[PDB]
Amino acid sequence: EELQYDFERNLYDISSSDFFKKVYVSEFDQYGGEPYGAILGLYNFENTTNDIIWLTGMGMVAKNSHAPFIASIDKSFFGVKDLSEITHIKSFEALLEHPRYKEWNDFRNLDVAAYIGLTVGDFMLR
Amino acid sequence: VIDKLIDLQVNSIISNDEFRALEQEWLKVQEVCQEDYDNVEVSILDVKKEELQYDFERNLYDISSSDFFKKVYVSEFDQYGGEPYGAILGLYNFENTTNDIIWLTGMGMVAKNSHAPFIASIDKSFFGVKDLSEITHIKSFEALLEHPRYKEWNDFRNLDVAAYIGLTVGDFMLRQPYNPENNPVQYKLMEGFNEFVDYDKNESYLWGPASIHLVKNMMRSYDKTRWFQYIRGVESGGYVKNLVACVYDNKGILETKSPLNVLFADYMELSLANIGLIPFVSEKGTSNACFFSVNSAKKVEEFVDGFDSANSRLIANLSYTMCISRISHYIKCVIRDKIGSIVDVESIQKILSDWISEFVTTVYQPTPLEMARYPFRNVSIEVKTIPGKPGWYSCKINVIPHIQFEGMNTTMTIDTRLEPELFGTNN
Amino acid sequence: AKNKIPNSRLMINYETNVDGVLKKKELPYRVLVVGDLSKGRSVDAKKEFADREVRRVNNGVDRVLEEMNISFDFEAPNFVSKDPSNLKVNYRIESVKDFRPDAVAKKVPEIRALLEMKEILASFAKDIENNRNL
């Protein structure tokens, strides 16, 4: 939420984004600073029209700071309550043609999206 | 059971008038400012149609005193440090009324001078039908306009100002109604809300005029290219990828709903271009569109002399008057710098030509985009001083734009005379 | 000093003056749009047409909107809370996502009362207490 509010407030003024000022102009831009490389979003992003901005912003940074932002997507993406039941879907290619993903298909066309890399599946950690 | 309330409570105000009137009048505003290009700054001006109806209808015969005219021409285009406008966008729907006809006559009176093609949309009330989908039943609109009901309209198409108006037909669906399995409302992190339906069926759940995508392509045809050749056809301009379709499960299995208001056929694309309308035709199922025609409301005429006939065909074409307009934004903008400098007939013909020269060719480049950089084919610029006024001049340019494809007939036949070696007598 | 220094036998000066015609930055292709947005409910809309400063949308349609005080006090059927009086939806639009059947329930005070219970009532741990296991 502390980033949701950040990008959604400074989407059209990223250079003033607080986070952007802790990765680009802070360590990558400055002289003695040590630049970052490949950020890791520990969050799960849905098909919401809010979480879509979150990527649009983080990618706006990554694109400039040069740091591929890797993250994961929730099972709520494919419109299913159990991720195991994604196997039932024949082809996701025909899925995205559904008008429910209109907002998402627009984001895939953005340049910044060439730095986002979303992962599917979750490993058992304990 | 608290869900039963909310599914009634909220659904009472989303369906309510006035509330969903702002939706329509903001969703289609968001649609325009979605792209965000490198050098295309849009701008708003929220005004009721009536506040302009009263304006032009009061100052039709005195436009220079029109309040709106004094917020686009003499305000930003005329003034020095001002940034001129380009291609106004009327978010309204204009009927065949003898009032709304003046509204265009006035706005065009401005556009004509301010040099800013006024794009808008026309209501289904134009063709005298209560459902726009039922326009498909009309055979040829060409024979329609001969009907004496359009007398007032045919007079307007003859006006010079009409060469800047560009009216669009068809309305794209701008919002998908709310279902749980389709387009679920993004609830909160604890307040269960995603289980929430709406109430619609046939054809009455929010629309927006095609004019948006039309202008939203002119913007595209500027950040990428630089002029306005890139707003027509599939391969070239108007394609409009990824529209907000709709799906619903009545009894079958999610029967999709085409994103466009009306599914124009082929000869509809053309039989509208002659009326002076811009059809927003859809590809069936593909959930996409394209602008084949981009004609103004100017009459096309016909004429006997071939040249004259071709003149009227290019003038009616909106895409050119968009480009020719961009030259006016060069003259009354840049040459203002050397307003006091000592210059001649041979010097103004230099500055004005040396510029436009980089945009005129005859050779064709591979791909459409790489060639649409060059709108014009060739240009003449014969300026000349006038008697009396010593420091004054009078230019007269003439531009031939790269004529677009528009259609063709074709007669196939088995000749059997091409290769006589196989069918000839001598063997 | 205009008085000018007394000239020596070897006066060197170094010219640093440069003439030339200044440059001009390009013009952003402006696009004006005209439509009834506020329906007569905004700071620039409530004013006379002789003085309506056009907007810009420098930021986005989200913030250029919030810049305008677009509120509305229209009535609507009541199905929440007690006492008479139809529900009076009254809140100003910030973002464009305000028309979303969700941000509405967060804004309208009356509806929020039912949503408030769904946070507490539905969060009843009848799965932690029912799952006793000795």
XYZ file of C-alpha atoms in Angstrom:
687
model
C 0.000 0.000 0.000
C 2.886 2.386 0.766
C 3.973 1.924 -2.861
C 0.451 1.696 -4.262
C -0.075 5.215 -3.000
C 3.351 6.216 -4.275
C 3.140 5.345 -7.967
C -0.593 6.033 -8.214
C 0.188 9.553 -6.984
C 3.292 10.036 -9.158
C 2.561 7.956 -12.239
C 2.720 11.089 -14.364
C 5.722 12.421 -12.473
C 7.917 9.428 -11.706
C 11.099 11.432 -11.103
C 9.438 12.720 -7.924
C 8.437 9.229 -6.768
C 9.925 8.479 -3.344
C 10.952 4.944 -4.316
C 12.437 6.165 -7.584
C 14.524 8.415 -5.340
C 15.981 5.367 -3.560
C 17.219 3.338 -6.514
C 17.805 5.679 -9.451
C 18.816 9.073 -8.072
C 20.428 7.760 -4.892
C 22.769 4.930 -5.851
C 22.602 4.452 -9.619
C 22.772 8.112 -10.584
C 25.137 9.384 -7.902
C 28.902 9.066 -8.194
C 30.116 6.908 -5.306
C 26.815 5.041 -5.277
C 26.515 1.324 -5.978
C 23.696 0.689 -8.496
C 21.013 -1.964 -8.048
C 20.358 -4.875 -10.388
C 17.157 -6.866 -10.864
C 14.646 -5.869 -8.193
C 12.529 -8.654 -6.666
C 8.858 -8.020 -5.933
C 7.809 -10.399 -3.183
C 4.151 -9.533 -3.847
C 1.402 -11.266 -5.836
C -0.266 -9.177 -8.549
C -3.825 -9.753 -9.712
C -5.706 -8.528 -12.786
C -6.946 -5.517 -10.823
C -6.784 -2.065 -12.388
C -4.859 -0.906 -9.306
C -2.120 -3.551 -9.146
C -1.682 -2.926 -12.867
C -0.437 0.563 -12.080
C 1.896 -0.828 -9.434
C 3.747 -2.648 -12.220
C 3.410 0.319 -14.550
C 5.216 2.423 -11.966
C 7.841 -0.066 -10.800
C 8.593 -0.750 -14.445
C 8.825 2.994 -15.058
C 11.687 2.895 -12.546
C 13.287 -0.392 -13.602
C 13.250 0.797 -17.203
C 15.378 3.805 -16.273
C 17.389 2.426 -13.361
C 18.020 -0.623 -15.572
C 16.937 -3.321 -13.147
C 14.480 -5.997 -14.407
C 11.664 -6.118 -11.855
C 10.770 -9.766 -11.202
C 7.541 -10.665 -9.394
C 4.741 -13.230 -9.105
C 1.064 -13.355 -10.071
C -1.794 -14.566 -7.893
C -4.152 -17.369 -8.861
C -6.803 -14.626 -9.048
C -5.347 -13.689 -12.423
C -6.802 -16.597 -14.378
C -10.084 -16.098 -12.521
C -9.738 -19.287 -10.472
C -9.738 -19.855 -6.708
C -7.259 -22.743 -6.800
C -4.056 -22.444 -8.793
C -3.991 -26.197 -9.344
C -7.135 -25.754 -11.458
C -5.247 -23.747 -14.076
C -4.339 -27.077 -15.651
C -7.973 -27.365 -16.787
C -7.654 -24.336 -19.071
C -6.806 -25.474 -22.577
C -4.918 -22.490 -23.978
C -4.277 -19.222 -22.169
C -3.706 -17.692 -25.580
C -7.455 -17.844 -26.238
C -8.072 -16.761 -22.641
C -6.500 -13.321 -22.964
C -8.818 -12.617 -25.899
C -11.595 -12.459 -23.284
C -12.593 -8.796 -22.614
C -11.819 -9.246 -18.930
C -8.121 -8.774 -19.718
C -8.540 -5.619 -21.785
C -6.709 -3.462 -19.257
C -3.944 -6.060 -19.084
C -3.412 -6.332 -22.835
C -2.873 -2.568 -22.888
C -0.118 -2.862 -20.284
C 1.649 -5.601 -22.243
C 2.017 -3.081 -25.055
C 3.862 -0.535 -22.896
C 7.636 -0.286 -23.215
C 8.148 -0.581 -19.465
C 6.634 -4.071 -19.543
C 9.826 -5.309 -21.213
C 11.407 -5.255 -17.743
C 8.640 -6.895 -15.745
C 8.916 -10.685 -15.481
C 6.023 -12.383 -13.724
C 6.243 -15.932 -12.370
C 3.571 -18.620 -11.974
C 3.515 -21.339 -9.339
C 4.608 -21.214 -5.715
C 7.141 -23.555 -4.128
C 6.558 -25.056 -0.717
C 9.017 -23.302 1.601
C 8.291 -25.127 4.836
C -27.210 -11.821 3.292
C -25.517 -8.426 3.675
C -24.328 -9.053 0.110
C -27.989 -9.048 -0.961
C -28.275 -5.465 0.309
C -25.139 -4.105 -1.351
C -26.097 -5.870 -4.589
C -29.228 -3.712 -4.385
C -27.903 -0.584 -2.688
C -24.978 0.256 -4.956
C -26.801 -1.120 -8.003
C -29.437 1.563 -7.362
C -27.075 4.503 -7.984
C -24.877 2.969 -10.703
C -28.041 2.505 -12.769
C -29.262 5.954 -11.732
C -29.208 8.756 -14.286
C -26.970 11.788 -13.700
C -24.477 9.506 -11.923
C -23.828 7.407 -15.017
C -23.929 10.583 -17.102
C -20.604 11.634 -15.573
C -19.263 8.127 -16.193
C -19.928 8.437 -19.909
C -18.495 11.947 -19.838
C -15.245 10.831 -18.149
C -14.639 7.311 -19.401
C -14.361 8.706 -22.906
C -12.081 11.417 -21.524
C -9.792 8.797 -20.021
C -9.847 6.984 -23.354
C -8.194 9.927 -25.105
C -5.485 10.579 -22.512
C -4.510 6.912 -22.222
C -1.680 6.840 -24.737
C 0.446 9.745 -23.485
C 2.965 10.578 -26.218
C 6.235 12.495 -26.285
C 4.911 15.799 -27.636
C 1.100 15.780 -27.706
C -0.358 17.755 -24.822
C -4.141 17.447 -24.716
C -6.395 19.867 -22.842
C -9.938 20.121 -21.516
C -12.791 22.611 -21.566
C -15.936 21.370 -19.798
C -18.887 23.205 -21.352
C -22.545 22.349 -21.787
C -23.771 22.151 -25.360
C -26.385 24.787 -24.585
C -23.714 27.265 -23.430
C -22.275 27.052 -26.953
C -25.633 26.721 -28.694
C -26.468 30.137 -27.322
C -22.997 31.374 -28.216
C -22.816 30.690 -31.951
C -26.543 31.202 -32.516
C -26.073 34.687 -31.055
C -22.812 35.438 -32.899
C -23.139 33.485 -36.128
C -22.957 36.731 -38.076
C -20.221 38.110 -35.848
C -17.948 35.196 -35.018
C -14.948 37.321 -34.020
C -16.964 38.355 -30.958
C -17.881 34.763 -30.066
C -16.672 33.912 -26.557
C -15.368 30.488 -27.593
C -13.655 31.951 -30.645
C -11.911 34.182 -28.110
C -10.464 31.123 -26.344
C -8.846 29.316 -29.259
C -8.119 31.835 -32.013
C -7.428 35.195 -30.382
C -6.045 33.798 -27.130
C -3.478 31.143 -27.996
C -3.268 30.858 -31.782
C -3.209 34.567 -32.549
C -1.177 35.815 -29.597
C 2.609 35.698 -29.547
C 3.672 33.454 -26.665
C 0.489 31.429 -27.033
C 0.456 27.745 -27.935
C -2.076 27.103 -30.740
C -4.640 24.297 -30.674
C -4.916 21.481 -33.200
C -7.946 19.361 -34.075
C -10.745 20.093 -31.611
C -12.837 17.129 -30.425
C -16.590 17.539 -30.016
C -17.757 14.968 -27.495
C -21.381 15.683 -28.463
C -23.832 13.922 -30.786
C -25.357 16.066 -33.541
C -28.755 15.374 -35.064
C -30.409 16.663 -38.241
C -31.988 19.503 -36.264
C -31.867 23.035 -37.641
C -30.303 24.124 -34.335
C -27.451 21.616 -34.043
C -26.705 22.457 -37.672
C -25.730 25.957 -36.608
C -23.581 24.549 -33.819
C -21.385 22.971 -36.499
C -21.664 26.036 -38.708
C -20.224 28.087 -35.865
C -17.585 25.676 -34.576
C -16.466 25.221 -38.161
C -16.381 28.999 -38.569
C -13.764 28.913 -35.803
C -11.894 25.770 -36.860
C -11.666 27.144 -40.387
C -9.797 30.199 -39.116
C -7.993 28.773 -36.095
C -6.992 25.880 -38.377
C -8.148 23.006 -36.198
C -10.328 20.280 -37.810
C -13.356 19.885 -35.548
C -14.105 16.169 -35.157
C -17.434 15.016 -33.709
C -20.105 12.305 -33.807
C -23.662 12.043 -35.124
C -26.642 10.579 -33.290
C -28.742 7.718 -34.610
C -31.511 10.334 -34.916
C -29.801 11.516 -38.091
C -30.908 8.644 -40.310
C -34.368 8.880 -38.753
C -34.042 5.610 -36.835
C -34.361 4.845 -33.119
C -31.728 2.094 -33.111
C -28.375 2.657 -34.772
C -28.054 -1.054 -35.493
C -31.008 -0.659 -37.874
C -29.001 1.574 -40.201
C -27.769 -1.619 -41.840
C -31.260 -2.028 -43.328
C -30.898 1.126 -45.425
C -29.667 0.220 -48.885
C -27.825 3.362 -49.956
C -27.534 6.560 -47.942
C -26.733 8.294 -51.205
C -30.391 7.988 -52.224
C -31.396 8.850 -48.656
C -29.991 12.376 -48.664
C -32.063 13.115 -51.769
C -35.076 12.997 -49.427
C -36.330 16.566 -48.682
C -35.877 15.964 -44.967
C -32.153 16.659 -45.376
C -32.549 19.894 -47.322
C -31.082 22.004 -44.530
C -28.207 19.543 -44.217
C -27.317 19.495 -47.911
C -26.981 23.278 -47.730
C -24.470 22.987 -44.895
C -22.378 20.446 -46.804
C -21.890 23.126 -49.447
C -20.398 25.642 -47.003
C -16.629 26.096 -46.950
C -16.450 25.632 -43.186
C -17.756 22.078 -43.575
C -14.361 21.090 -44.990
C -13.115 21.043 -41.384
C -15.960 19.163 -39.741
C -15.503 15.385 -39.629
C -18.448 13.454 -38.240
C -18.165 9.854 -37.040
C -20.712 7.016 -37.032
C -20.861 4.164 -34.542
C -20.113 4.154 -30.829
C -17.614 1.863 -29.120
C -18.429 0.158 -25.855
C -16.292 1.910 -23.235
C -17.216 -0.116 -20.173
C -18.018 -3.746 -19.604
C -20.962 -4.206 -17.211
C -20.222 -5.815 -13.835
C -20.400 -9.592 -13.440
C -18.619 -11.790 -10.895
C -17.209 -14.207 -13.477
C -16.705 -11.368 -15.974
C -15.187 -7.998 -15.077
C -15.410 -8.421 -11.279
C -15.386 -5.244 -9.196
C -11.998 -5.021 -7.527
C -13.093 -5.355 -3.907
C -11.053 -4.402 -0.845
C -8.500 -6.467 1.108
C -11.227 -7.747 3.463
C -14.590 -6.298 2.397
C -15.947 -9.060 0.170
C -17.369 -7.242 -2.835
C -16.221 -9.151 -5.932
C -19.491 -11.085 -5.808
C -21.479 -8.244 -7.339
C -23.689 -8.167 -10.434
C -25.288 -5.483 -12.611
C -28.511 -5.402 -14.687
C -28.535 -5.205 -18.488
C -29.481 -7.332 -21.514
C -30.163 -6.072 -25.054
C -28.479 -2.739 -25.872
C -28.322 -0.066 -23.163
C -25.146 -0.125 -21.074
C -22.882 2.872 -21.701
C -21.444 4.002 -25.019
C -18.878 6.454 -26.343
C -18.481 8.198 -29.719
C -16.000 6.858 -32.297
C -14.609 10.357 -32.595
C -12.364 9.583 -29.619
C -10.406 6.828 -31.321
C -10.359 8.960 -34.420
C -8.555 11.784 -32.623
C -6.652 9.295 -30.482
C -5.196 8.074 -33.789
C -4.324 11.551 -35.017
C -2.251 11.825 -31.852
C -0.687 8.465 -32.675
C -0.207 9.716 -36.214
C 2.086 12.403 -34.883
C 4.280 10.889 -32.206
C 5.251 8.103 -34.603
C 5.146 9.849 -37.960
C 4.717 13.636 -37.993
C 1.775 14.319 -40.319
C -1.711 12.856 -40.723
C -1.488 10.203 -43.433
C -1.388 7.527 -40.763
C -5.094 7.620 -39.827
C -6.673 5.555 -42.598
C -6.912 1.917 -43.599
C -5.792 -1.222 -41.817
C -2.174 -1.554 -42.845
C -1.596 2.204 -42.590
C -3.522 4.228 -40.014
C -6.757 3.471 -38.214
C -6.651 -0.016 -36.747
C -7.555 0.618 -33.097
C -6.281 -2.526 -31.415
C -7.914 -4.163 -28.392
C -11.393 -2.782 -27.657
C -13.642 -3.322 -24.655
C -15.949 -6.076 -25.871
C -18.530 -7.849 -23.721
C -19.577 -11.412 -22.926
C -22.662 -12.798 -21.209
C -24.192 -16.127 -20.228
C -27.947 -15.966 -20.820
C -28.531 -19.673 -21.479
C -25.862 -20.727 -23.978
C -22.133 -20.563 -23.263
C -20.839 -16.982 -23.001
C -22.098 -15.491 -26.265
C -19.709 -12.630 -27.048
C -20.972 -9.125 -27.858
C -19.237 -7.106 -30.579
C -17.470 -4.003 -29.181
C -19.003 -1.736 -31.815
C -22.516 -0.351 -31.898
C -23.066 -1.391 -35.500
C -21.493 -4.010 -37.764
C -21.015 -2.051 -40.980
C -20.695 -4.115 -44.131
C -18.355 -3.270 -47.002
C -20.504 -1.016 -49.174
C -21.597 0.735 -45.981
C -17.983 1.858 -45.492
C -18.236 3.580 -48.845
C -21.894 4.583 -49.025
C -21.214 6.656 -45.905
C -18.037 8.297 -47.196
C -20.149 9.982 -49.864
C -22.549 11.458 -47.314
C -19.590 13.057 -45.560
C -19.431 10.718 -42.597
C -16.691 8.721 -40.914
C -17.757 5.116 -40.283
C -16.059 3.210 -37.439
C -16.367 -0.260 -38.950
C -15.631 -3.419 -36.989
C -14.073 -6.756 -37.901
C -16.607 -9.387 -36.889
C -15.412 -11.279 -33.815
C -11.887 -9.860 -34.020
C -12.885 -7.340 -31.328
C -11.228 -4.575 -33.381
C -11.999 -1.762 -35.809
C -10.492 0.547 -38.461
C -11.219 3.826 -40.229
C -11.417 3.215 -43.967
C -12.897 6.595 -44.762
C -11.874 9.906 -43.268
C -13.966 12.407 -45.158
C -15.258 15.785 -44.089
C -18.866 16.841 -44.471
C -17.915 18.789 -47.601
C -19.846 17.888 -50.751
C -17.834 15.845 -53.239
C -19.540 17.183 -56.383
C -18.692 15.491 -59.705
C -18.053 17.916 -62.579
C -17.237 17.212 -66.218
C -13.640 18.396 -66.370
C -11.489 15.636 -64.879
C -9.191 17.965 -62.954
C -12.067 19.796 -61.274
C -13.594 16.444 -60.343
C -10.365 15.395 -58.639
C -10.036 18.682 -56.757
C -13.320 18.172 -54.943
C -12.326 14.609 -54.093
C -9.195 15.704 -52.241
C -10.752 18.684 -50.517
C -13.515 16.577 -49.000
C -10.765 14.324 -47.657
C -10.178 15.303 -44.038
C -6.709 13.796 -43.707
C -5.249 16.355 -46.121
C -6.913 19.433 -44.596
C -5.310 18.221 -41.378
C -1.934 18.447 -43.104
C -2.512 21.624 -45.056
C -3.583 23.067 -41.719
C -0.178 22.222 -40.269
C 1.380 24.610 -42.778
C -0.760 27.460 -41.482
C 0.587 26.596 -38.028
C 4.006 27.061 -39.576
C 3.453 30.373 -41.329
C 1.473 32.173 -38.611
C 3.891 30.906 -35.959
C 7.457 30.855 -37.247
C 7.695 33.628 -39.835
C 6.517 35.899 -37.012
C 10.141 35.912 -35.882
C 11.318 37.764 -38.989
C 8.517 40.304 -38.990
C 10.856 43.292 -39.011
C 13.821 41.800 -40.839
C 14.538 42.997 -44.348
C 13.300 40.321 -46.712
C 12.198 39.999 -50.314
C 9.951 38.106 -52.660
C 12.908 35.806 -53.294
C 13.719 35.422 -49.589
C 10.289 34.430 -48.284
C 10.089 31.866 -51.076
C 13.321 30.488 -49.626
C 12.437 30.219 -45.932
C 8.989 28.799 -46.599
C 10.197 26.346 -49.248
C 13.440 25.201 -47.605
C 11.248 23.930 -44.793
C 8.470 22.100 -46.613
C 11.057 20.634 -48.985
C 11.983 17.918 -46.468
C 8.400 16.622 -46.626
C 7.931 16.250 -50.381
C 8.935 13.240 -52.436
C 7.931 11.095 -55.380
C 9.763 7.888 -54.528
C 7.961 5.389 -52.296
C 9.517 3.947 -49.168
C 8.996 0.357 -47.986
C 6.196 -0.041 -45.431
C 3.520 2.623 -44.905
C 5.002 4.308 -41.851
C 8.422 4.895 -43.404
C 6.695 6.699 -46.283
C 3.957 8.580 -44.395
C 6.823 10.754 -43.142
C 6.276 12.407 -46.527
C 2.689 13.649 -46.793
C 2.950 15.861 -49.867
C 3.970 15.004 -53.424
C 4.987 18.432 -54.702
C 4.451 22.086 -53.844
C 4.513 25.506 -55.492
C 5.119 28.728 -53.561
C 4.672 31.902 -55.602
C 4.794 34.900 -53.283
C 4.808 38.419 -54.673
C 4.785 41.949 -53.343
C 1.731 44.137 -53.819
C 1.582 47.796 -54.862
C 0.920 50.498 -52.289
C 1.928 48.585 -49.177
C 5.738 48.316 -49.417
C 6.470 45.947 -46.533
C 3.470 43.721 -47.248
C 3.277 40.598 -49.416
C 0.789 37.997 -50.601
C 1.677 34.323 -50.832
C -0.171 31.563 -52.673
C 0.880 27.962 -52.140
C -0.555 24.826 -53.657
C 0.012 21.316 -52.358
C -0.689 17.952 -53.958
C -0.828 15.324 -51.213
C 0.040 11.671 -51.801
C -3.302 10.377 -53.033
C -4.466 7.438 -50.993
C -5.876 4.175 -52.262
C -9.683 4.198 -52.305
C -10.841 1.116 -54.243
C -10.874 -0.549 -57.656
C -12.931 -2.645 -60.056
C -11.596 -5.732 -61.818
C -12.722 -7.847 -64.761
C -11.302 -11.362 -64.915
C -11.661 -13.334 -68.146
C -10.345 -16.372 -69.986
C -8.844 -14.757 -73.084
C -7.344 -17.756 -74.893
C -5.787 -15.162 -77.218
C -2.812 -14.311 -75.048
C -0.890 -17.439 -76.018
C -1.934 -18.158 -79.631
C 0.773 -20.815 -79.904
C -1.654 -23.220 -78.195
C -4.986 -22.190 -79.744
C -3.929 -20.710 -83.073
C -4.583 -22.236 -86.473
C -0.949 -22.759 -87.457
C 0.257 -25.970 -85.818
C 33.226 51.301 -16.228
C 32.353 53.576 -19.150
C 35.265 55.874 -18.275
C 37.500 53.173 -19.759
C 40.936 52.173 -18.498
C 43.952 54.201 -19.680
C 45.517 52.538 -22.717
C 48.916 50.966 -22.226
C 51.368 50.136 -25.009
C 50.136 46.542 -25.398
C 46.447 46.379 -24.622
C 44.990 42.874 -25.035
C 41.262 42.487 -24.280
C 39.818 39.098 -25.327
C 36.363 39.367 -26.930
C 33.710 37.178 -25.305
C 30.669 38.655 -27.031
C 28.594 36.493 -29.359
C 25.699 37.515 -31.598
C 23.082 35.282 -33.172
C 19.375 34.538 -33.343
C 17.947 32.579 -30.425
C 16.327 29.195 -30.869
C 12.691 28.147 -30.553
C 11.504 25.005 -28.779
C 9.010 22.831 -30.647
C 5.249 23.187 -30.226
C 3.410 20.266 -28.611
C 0.480 19.345 -30.849
C -2.335 20.485 -28.580
C -5.710 18.748 -28.665
C -8.733 20.586 -27.351
C -11.766 18.563 -26.272
C -15.145 20.107 -25.536
C -17.900 18.221 -23.732
C -20.222 18.545 -20.747
C -18.010 16.988 -18.070
C -19.101 18.633 -14.851
C -22.764 19.048 -15.851
C -22.368 22.447 -14.187
C -20.434 21.301 -11.117
C -16.844 22.530 -11.086
C -14.771 25.559 -10.118
C -14.150 26.538 -13.746
C -17.603 25.337 -14.846
C -19.583 27.425 -12.360
C -17.877 30.543 -13.699
C -18.982 32.568 -16.727
C -17.826 31.378 -20.144
C -16.039 34.691 -20.687
C -13.508 33.439 -18.116
C -12.924 29.667 -18.193
C -9.261 28.766 -17.958
C -8.742 25.656 -20.070
C -7.133 22.690 -18.296
C -4.033 20.821 -19.471
C -3.961 17.292 -18.055
C -0.209 17.621 -17.451
C -0.402 14.819 -14.928
C -3.370 12.637 -15.853
C -7.153 12.458 -15.946
C -6.898 11.280 -12.341
C -5.420 14.515 -10.969
C -6.849 17.057 -13.425
C -10.211 15.783 -12.230
C -9.454 16.149 -8.528
C -8.350 19.663 -9.436
C -12.020 20.321 -10.234
C -14.500 20.166 -7.355
C -16.852 17.657 -8.992
C -19.350 16.668 -6.325
C -23.021 15.753 -6.510
C -25.907 15.598 -4.046
C -28.436 13.471 -5.926
C -31.024 11.345 -4.124
C -31.295 7.565 -4.312
C -33.405 4.679 -2.923
C -32.464 3.735 0.646
C -31.798 0.179 1.833
C -29.395 0.838 4.705
C -29.462 2.371 8.194
C -32.577 3.396 10.117
C -34.943 6.388 10.073
C -36.624 7.908 6.978
C -34.956 10.075 4.301
C -33.726 8.612 1.019
C -30.010 7.897 0.751
C -28.121 11.025 -0.280
C -24.950 10.199 -2.222
C -22.602 13.088 -1.448
C -18.879 12.960 -2.183
C -16.422 14.598 -4.576
C -14.717 12.678 -7.374
C -10.957 12.227 -6.922
C -9.843 9.597 -9.444
C -11.633 8.129 -12.470
C -11.977 4.839 -10.591
C -14.564 6.508 -8.358
C -17.464 5.276 -10.507
C -16.259 1.752 -9.728
C -18.998 -0.094 -7.787
C -16.633 -0.394 -4.827
C -15.093 3.017 -4.311
C -18.734 4.049 -4.016
C -19.390 1.829 -0.992
C -16.219 3.285 0.539
C -17.401 6.857 -0.022
C -21.128 6.828 0.771
C -21.344 6.929 4.607
C -24.512 4.814 4.844
C -23.353 1.888 2.700
C -20.034 1.803 4.557
C -21.992 0.690 7.630
C -22.749 -2.672 6.001
C -19.216 -3.004 4.664
C -17.944 -2.336 8.177
C -19.742 -5.435 9.479
C -18.361 -7.589 6.660
C -14.926 -6.851 8.103
C -15.886 -7.889 11.634
C -18.877 -10.225 11.253
C -17.456 -12.298 8.394
C -14.084 -12.512 10.152
C -15.644 -14.755 12.804
C -13.136 -17.521 13.478
C -15.614 -20.409 13.385
C -12.779 -22.419 11.831
C -10.163 -21.806 14.530
C -12.627 -22.419 17.360
C -14.437 -25.280 15.605
C -11.058 -26.863 14.889
C -10.527 -27.759 18.545
C -8.472 -30.985 18.416
C -8.328 -32.025 22.095
